[PDB]
């Protein structure tokens, strides 16, 4: 399993062209904000390929 | 007036642009700096040599990841001067269009005290830094 390559899956808005974002903050999928590292209706911004 | 700060968070949350021109050379670097409350550059005054010398570089404190870095050739510029009115004018234009950070510049001799020089002058491009970052607010860096 080569999980060394990650890709961004959740974002608040589409970034501009030729822009690089290395934000590792937990995305807020629900109406309530998220805190810490985990939480209900919260997801990690990066995911590994299979 | 030496350098400027560029970024959107300025607290190690995202990337930021660092442009500083101190008594040695110009440095252009893009890291996740931790900018403090009042970052500036300190210069000693009259250290029994009848001259000046920079000794403080309080701008940031850490850098986790750096995507861009550039150090210009070192040079020697004076750090002294006491005149009753301004003698030089520095005009710059910065634009962030499609990740290209265009920088314009122009210099002209002026003789004014507390007024903007009324006149006209053209601005020429100098460099194109492909920082590709999101800039929201900026902050200048003065000398002590
Ligand atoms: C002339 O300048 C030099 C350096 O620009 C001075 O040397 C420094 O003096 C300070 C004063 O305490 C010290 O903290 C530094 O460690 C010194 N640096 C070096 C490399 O020696 C020098 O003192 C100045 N001349 C006089 C007469 O003060
Ligand atoms: C850039 O940053 C501002 C302020 O942080 C934000 O409102 C905007 O959505 C950001 N744009 C992109 C493309 O990330
Ligand atoms: C600031 O000037 C000192 C010498 O006065 C030099 O050693 C240093 O490299 C300069 N800063 C930068 C970022 O180049
Ligand atoms: C930030 O620093 C931590 C600890 O040094 C490191 O694990 C992490 O990978 C760094 N961030 C990035 C984007 O590499």
Curated annotation (Swiss-Prot), chain B:
Record annotation: effect of changing residue 110 to V: In strain: Omicron/BA.2.75
Effect of residue 134 to Q: Increased resistance to neutralizing antibodies
Substitution effect: residue 113 to G: In strain: Omicron/BA.2, Omicron/BA.2.12.1, Omicron/BA.2.75, Omicron/BA.4, Omicron/BA.5, Omicron/BQ.1.1
Effect of residue 54 to K: In strain: Kappa/B.1.617.1
Residues listed as glycosylation sites in the UniProt record: 22, 49, 65, 134
Chain spans, region Disordered: 42-64, 73-85
Result after altering residue 2 to I: In strain: A23.1
Disulphide bond pairs: 31-66
Self-association and partners: Binds to host ACE2. RBD also interacts with the N-linked glycan on 'Asn-90' of ACE2. Cleavage of S generates a polybasic C-terminal sequence on S1 that binds to host Neuropilin-1 (NRP1) and Neuropilin-2 (NRP2) receptors. Interacts with host integrin alpha-5/beta-1 (ITGA5:ITGB1) and with ACE2 in complex with integrin alpha-5/beta-1 (ITGA5:ITGB1). May interact via cytoplasmic c-terminus with M protein. May interact (via N-terminus) with host bilirubin and biliverdin, thereby preventing antibody binding to the SARS-CoV-2 spike NTD via an allosteric mechanism.
Role: Attaches the virion to the cell membrane by interacting with host receptor, initiating the infection. The major receptor is host ACE2. When S2/S2' has been cleaved, binding to the receptor triggers direct fusion at the cell membrane. When S2/S2' has not been cleaved, binding to the receptor results in internalization of the virus by endocytosis using host TFRC and GRM2 and leading to fusion of the virion membrane with the host endosomal membrane. Alternatively, may use NRP1/NRP2 and integrin as entry receptors.
Protein name in UniProt: Spike protein S1
Segment of the intact protein contained: 101 to 244 of 1273
